[PDB]
Amino acid sequence: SELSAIETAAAIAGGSMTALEACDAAIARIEQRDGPINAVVVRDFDRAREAAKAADGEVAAGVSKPLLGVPMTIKESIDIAGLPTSWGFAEHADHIATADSVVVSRLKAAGAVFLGKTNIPVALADWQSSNPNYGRTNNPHDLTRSAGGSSGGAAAALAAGMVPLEYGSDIGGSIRVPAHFCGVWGLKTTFDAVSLEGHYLPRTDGARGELGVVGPMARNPQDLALALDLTSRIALPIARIDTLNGLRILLLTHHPRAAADSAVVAAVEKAAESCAAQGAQVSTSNADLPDLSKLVSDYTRMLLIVLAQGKAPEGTEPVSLNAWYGMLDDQARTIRGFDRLFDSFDAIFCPVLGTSAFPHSDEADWGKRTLTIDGADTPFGSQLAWISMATYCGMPALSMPVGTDANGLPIGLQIITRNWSDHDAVRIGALVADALAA
Numbered sequence: 001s002e003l004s005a006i007e008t009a010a011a012i013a014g015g016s017m018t019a020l021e022a023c024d025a026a027i028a029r030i031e032q033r034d035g036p037i038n039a040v041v042v043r044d045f046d047r048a049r050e051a052a053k054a055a056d057g058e059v060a061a062g063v064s065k066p067l068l069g070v071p072m073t074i075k076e077s078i079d080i081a082g083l084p085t086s087w088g089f090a091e092h093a094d095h096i097a098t099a100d101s102v103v104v105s106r107l108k109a110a111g112a113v114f115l116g117k118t119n120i121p122v123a124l125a126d127w128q129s130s131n132p133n134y135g136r137t138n139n140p141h142d143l144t145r146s147a148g149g150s151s152g153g154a155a156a157a158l159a160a161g162m163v164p165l166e167y168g169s170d171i172g173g174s175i176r177v178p179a180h181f182c183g184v185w186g187l188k189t190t191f192d193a194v195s196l197e198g199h200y201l202p203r204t205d206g207a208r209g210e211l212g213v214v215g216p217m218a219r220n221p222q223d224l225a226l227a228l229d230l231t232s233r234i235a236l237p238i239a240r241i242d243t244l245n246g247l248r249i250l251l252l253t254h255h256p257r258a259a260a261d262s263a264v265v266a267a268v269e270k271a272a273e274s275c276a277a278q279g280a281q282v283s284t285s286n287a288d289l290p291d292l293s294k295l296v297s298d299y300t301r302m303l304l305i306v307l308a309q310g311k312a313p314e315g316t317e318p319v320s321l322n323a324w325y326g327m328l329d330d331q332a333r334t335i336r337g338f339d340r341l342f343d344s345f346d347a348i349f350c351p352v353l354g355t356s357a358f359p360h361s362d363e364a365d366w367g368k369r370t371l372t373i374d375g376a377d378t379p380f381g382s383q384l385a386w387i388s389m390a391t392y393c394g395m396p397a398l399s400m401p402v403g404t405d406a407n408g409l410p411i412g413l414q415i416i417t418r419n420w421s422d423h424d425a426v427r428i429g430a431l432v433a434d435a436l437a438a
């Protein structure tokens with residue numbers, strides 16, 4: 001493959017290459033590779049090479065920083081000063097951000113260089129990345145399939161080797177699902193651990209909502225861990241895990257509210273037997289597991305209120321504030337349920353989604369889509385079940401590649417750890433990957 005973000009940084013810091021050559025190589029890969037993929041839909045190449053020269057002025061003057069001169073892109077829905085943030089809305093094509101987002105400001109502070117931004121579905125509301133401003137992003141592994149969404153272009157740029165680092169957002173699996181579909185690494189972070197300032201509905205500038213998070217995306221866990229330390233509000237607890245021996249794993253290949261294809265089950269199951277072969281204690285049932293079906297209903301109820309900003313259609317009565325406060329009480333009760341579960345487990349292993357990447361759908365209404373699972377059509381939206389646990393209850397959740405299905409399409413494993421243990425999620429993935437090579 002290509003240089004990782006850390007390897008790029010270290011090459012720039014040893015002499016092997018200049019930030020501006022690094023920036024020009026990335027530009028080269030994007031132009032040579034993005035034609036059929038359409039992942040880098042906002043390009044800031046001229047300014048990017050200026051800041052690359054600026055980065056080289058620093059290196060020539062003794063300066064070092066963990067990402068100095070490292071080229072990267074970011075999800076279109078995160079503000080970069082001077083660049084559109086439209087979220088795919090035609091009405092906001094020309095909404096130009098005035099201020100870097102906090103994530104961007106943080107990575108810029110660490111010396112990174114921003115070449116542009118990556119494609120998203122309209123309103124960040126799909127497991128595909130398609131919109132009238134930029135068009136559609138195609139899975140580098142099979143151009144007839146979805147790149148995932150809403151962070152789909154991010155994952156596709158990573159998978160195609162264009163840039164070593166990205167940063168996405170997830171309120172309904174939009175980091176994990178595209179990483180899963182495209183065969184790269186994506187970390188949904190603990191709720192409220194990373195600032196969403198600059199991840200603004202276009203032309204707004206308010207408070208972060210419940211549920212949603214931003215987190216990094218990369219080709220490897222080392223880059224994720226570094227990107228996390230550079231962007232979290234405060235420094236998060238370092239990884240306590242340094243071996244799979246004795247690691248306690250809750251393996252969930254069933255969900256009461258969604259099916260999984262047998263290839264996906266096999267992939268996740270194999271990742272767990274592989275860990276076991278290194279000492280892990282793998283369980284398949286526990287009485288402290290919260291009601292996953294009630295969880296899906298509570299999460300969905302709250303997801304639709306959040307996305308609608310508390311509004312309801314004409315004739316329909318909105319939720320009262322007090323009822324909303326009751327919904328947060330419910331959410332807190334469920335969260336305590338997982339606190340008790342993590343007294344007995346270090347991680348949950350489960351699918352990210354019940355299928356690998358599906359063929360492009362032009363059907364806007366999820367209720368009219370299907371997904372083929374084990375040869376039969378099943379409801380498309382049911383699959384939110386798999387990503388509901390970590391979003392609703394706040395936990396960090398890694399999506400990492402662990403296999404390919406029979407058509408060559410990536411399959412990812414979801415690793416859920418306890419709140420604030422984001423670095424243990426990443427570290428356990430790193431160890432799953434060693435174990436599967438063994």
Ligand SMILES: Nc1ccc(Cc2ccc(N)cc2)cc1
Nearest residue numbers: 124125126149150172174365366
């Ligand atoms: N038709 C329809 C129904 C439900 C949703 C919720 C949602 C789904 C996926 C993501 N990544 C974010 C939000 C979006 C569209």
